[PDB]
Amino acid sequence: NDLKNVKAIAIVYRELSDGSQTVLLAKMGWMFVRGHVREDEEADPGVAAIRETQEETGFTGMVKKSGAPFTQPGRVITIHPHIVQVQEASKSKDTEDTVKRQFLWVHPSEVRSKLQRAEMIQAWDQLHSFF
Numbered sequence: 001n002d003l004k005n006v007k008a009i010a011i012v013y014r015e016l017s018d019g020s021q022t023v024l025l026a027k028m029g030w031m032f033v034r035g036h037v038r039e040d041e042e043a044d045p046g047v048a049a050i051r052e053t054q055e056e057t058g059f060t061g062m063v064k065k066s067g068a069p070f071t072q073p074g075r076v077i078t079i080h081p082h083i084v085q086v087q088e089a090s091k092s093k094d095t096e097d098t099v100k101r102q103f104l105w106v107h108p109s110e111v112r113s114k115l116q117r118a119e120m121i122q123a124w125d126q127l128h129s130f131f
Contacts, residue, residue, distance in 0.1 A: 002036035005077050009034055009123040010049040010084040012057065013131070014105070021131050024086075026056065027102040029116025032123060033057070037080065045080035057103075058095050059086035067126045072119050081123035083130055 010033035012024035025031065035052030037045045046063035054060050067081035106114070108131035115121050 001038040001040065003039060003042060004036075005075065006037040006042060006045070007034060007077055007079050007119075008037050008045040008048040008052065009079055009081045009119065010053045011082065011123060011127060012053055012059070012061070012084050012086055013108075014086060021108055022105045023108050023111050023131070024057065025104045025106060025111065025114055027104075028099070029120075030104065030114040031117065031120055033084070034119075046082050046084075049080070049082040049084050053084050053086065054090040054092050055094055056098065056101065057086065058090050058098060060088050060090040060092070061086035065127055065130055067123065070119075070122055070126070072122075079119050079123065081126055083127055 012033055013021045033053050033056050037048045041048045046066055061084045063082050064085045065083040069078050069080050072079055112124055
């Protein structure tokens with residue numbers, strides 16, 4: 001079902017009681033959530049952004065912003081960047097076992113320096129004005 005050449009990126013964040021935000025970074029350099037877009041998902045890749053957020057983090061959430069797609073080399077890949085706010089613990093049964101990852105919650109001003117891949121840098125520069 002996965003589209004070979006279409007991906008979604010989810011910039012995961014939590015809203016805090018004072019209105020500040022904290023952004024989630026993962027490392028298997030530091031990355032956002034990433035997964036393939038599926039065929040049934042290609043008309044709104046935010047559906048892929050949420051599902052991949054659940055599979056990797058155990059949180060569920062909502063897409064807060066959908067960014068303009070951009071192109072990256074492999075083959076040419078179209079990337080759909082999103083900001084996803086997480087709200088509740090996922091009940092999906094695809095989260096019963098997660099992939100081992102390092103996680104880190106950071107203030108938005110400390111996000112970009114930790115990114116190493118161009119597609120993560122691109123997604124962040126397109127959308128960080130939200131924070």
